[PDB]
Structures are given as C-alpha cells and as structure tokens.
Design a protein around this ligand. Structure first.
Ligand SMILES: [Ca+2]
Ligand SMILES: [Ca+2]
Ligand SMILES: [Ca+2]
Ligand SMILES: [Ca+2]
Ligand code: NA
Length: 343
C-alpha cells in the first residue's frame, strides 16, 4: 500500500515524501486530548487488510507518550507532556499488508508540543516617565529624559512565548496589543515590535495641562497584563509674549510731586513657566530724563534730581520682555502718556 494523499514528484511516478502534522498543549491529559488530530488524516490504500505502526523516531522516548491504533491509525497520548523536557517529536509511521509478503510504505509524523497561552503578559518596568516639548508636532515621539534625545522605550513580554530572565535581553516578538486606558485621543503607541513607543496624535499646550497620567495594558489574545502607570511631562517653550492689560495709559502728574514718587504701576503677564515667563521692564524712549522704571516691578517713578514743569507732556514707550534666551525671547510694548498739572 501507499499513504494518502499521493503527490507526484515532477517528471516521475513516485509520491512525494509525505509528512503528517499534529500539535498538543503541554501538561494536559490523555483523556482531555484523545484522540489527537492529524492533518491530513493518516490513511493508506491498496492499488488485503492494512497495519499501521510507528517504526522509529526522535527523541527515542516517543513510545512513552504515543501509541497508534493499528487498524484505524488513530494516535493516542499516554502521559501529559512537559514542554520543559519535550518540545517536538519526529516519527516514521509505517503501513503494510497483513500478508506475509508486505509492500510497505513510510511517512513522517511531526508532533509539535505547544506552550498554551495561559500566562498574561508583563512590562519589564514598574512605570514609565516620559517627556515632550509643547512645541512638538503631531507624529513626534515621547522621550525618556529632559534632553529629548532618547525615545521612551516600552517593553512588554509573555512567558508563553519566551522566558526571559529578569536581566535578560529578549529575542522573540510576543506579538501583543498595547492599549492606553486614558488620553487615547492625545497619544498613540506603536502597534508592533519588542520595544514599543509613544507619539502625539494632537499637539499639547503646557499652559493647559503640563502632566498626563494614564496606564497602559498589554494583551496576548486571551488575557491582559496588570496596568502600568505612564506619566508624561510637557516641557515649556517660550510661546507667550509678556502682554500689558492696556495699549495706552493716560496719566496726570502734579508739580508738587518729588523724586521717588509713584507715577503708574504697570504689570505685564507672561503665562510661560520658569524664566520664559519671568518679565523685565524698560523705557525704550520718551522719559526725556524725568522718569525711570523698576526693571523687576514695572513701577514708574519720577527720576532723581528732577522738577515737574507745568507745561510739559511726555509719551513713554515702555517694553516688557521675558528672560528667555535672546534667540527665543519675546516682548510687547505699551505707551504711557503723561501731562503735568498744577497741584
Ligand atoms: Ca500569553
Ligand atoms: Ca503653549
Ligand atoms: Ca514668554
Ligand atoms: Ca509655554
Ligand atoms: Na504556558
């Protein structure tokens, strides 16, 4: 006899060496899995009764685990299979005539022992602390430090795919899904690879929200990881000009006023953080000598050694500028208009 299916070797009359396939969960019992299923069904045919056996195989303890019924060719498991010790089996199945003159046939039978997807994935870190500049575009990549040079790396593994030791370099991609439980509208995460990354879906304003706290969760097709907390800091850029409440001030002074006295108290606002939002005031021109401004306070006073003459008018050009780097610094101007009355 000869095994089904027969597939001619091109340009001859031999069947192709045929190899049956089966696969089995580890640590599960004869009762549970029997009968073991074989693609394609093991069958042989004459062209009077047929006998199915196992000649040989590797490892040599194949007979500990596998018995083959000799008329049907049905395959049984005799013992649970611990994948730690046993991973595959390559057998040579035989089929012959129950005559004294057999015309026997051979096929292979590969048996794959499987790690079943009964463990939930984990992240190699207890939490994540990422950074991005409010100035970054859609598509840009969360970073691991204030330097914004390295991207934030998120590694999630599954022990049903490879048992990596707690220090260990991984080598197999567990083909997992990672999902954010919040801010799904703002951030996304690379959907493939051992290492995953974050990127913006939508730009972010430090002056709105400067921190994002959410968790990510892994999924292997069946179970999920514990959630792991990710935490994203939005770093300041100088996107806010020191603006004044008004564009013009009308201010009257009197002749009996003396040096040091208050004229007007200006106060600009710069929503930025740090020194990007720190304000410095100067009078660019118009003082004519008779007024000065507190660089820090925005309070204008009457200059030292100076007399208010009842005629005079002035137009002070006053500037507020933040203390960013000169290349990135901003400013905004208002005019204070003054006239001297008598007491
Ligand atoms: Ca798993
Ligand atoms: Ca902003
Ligand atoms: Ca600013
Ligand atoms: Ca800002
Ligand atoms: Na497993």
């Amino acid at each position: 006899p000869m095994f089904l299916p027969c597939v001619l070797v091109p340009n001859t009359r031999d069947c192709r060496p045929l190899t049956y396939q089966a696969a089995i969960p580890e640590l599960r019992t004869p009762e549970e899995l029997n009968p073991i299923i074989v693609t394609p069904p093991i069958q042989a045919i004459d062209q009077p009764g047929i006998l199915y056996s196992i000649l040989v195989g590797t490892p040599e303890d194949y007979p500990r685990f596998f018995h083959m019924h000799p008329r049907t060719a049905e395959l049984s498991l005799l013992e649970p299979v611990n994948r730690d010790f046993h991973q595959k089996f390559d057998l040579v199945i035989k089929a012959e005539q129950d005559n004294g003159h057999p015309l026997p046939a051979f096929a292979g039978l590969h048996i794959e022992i499987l790690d079943e997807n009964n463990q939930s994935p984990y992240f190699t870190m207890p939490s994540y602390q990422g950074y991005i500049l409010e100035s970054a575009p859609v598509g840009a990549t969360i970073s691991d430090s204030l330097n914004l040079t390295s991207p934030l790396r998120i590694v999630a593994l599954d022990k049903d795919i490879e048992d990596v030791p707690p220090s260990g370099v991984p080598t197999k991609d567990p083909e997992l899904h990672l999902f954010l439980n919040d801010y799904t509208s703002v951030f996304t995460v690379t959907q493939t690879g051992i290492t995953r990354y974050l990127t913006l879906l939508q730009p972010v304003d430090r002056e709105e929200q400067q921190t994002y706290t959410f968790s990510i969760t892994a999924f292997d097709g069946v179970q999920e990881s514990e959630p792991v907390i990710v935490n994203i800091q939005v770093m300041d850029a100088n996107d806010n000009t020191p603006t004044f409440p008004e564009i013009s001030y009308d201010v009257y002074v009197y002749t009996d006023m003396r040096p040091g006295d208050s004229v007007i108290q200006l106060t600009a606002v710069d929503a930025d953080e740090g020194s990007n939002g720190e304000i410095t005031y100067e009078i660019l021109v118009g003082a004519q000598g008779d007024f000065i401004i507190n660089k820090t306070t925005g309070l204008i006073t009457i200059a030292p050694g100076v007399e208010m003459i009842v005629g005079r008018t002035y137009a002070l050009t006053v500037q507020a500028a933040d203390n960013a780097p000169p290349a990135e610094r901003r400013n905004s101007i208002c005019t204070v208009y003054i006239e001297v009355l008598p007491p």
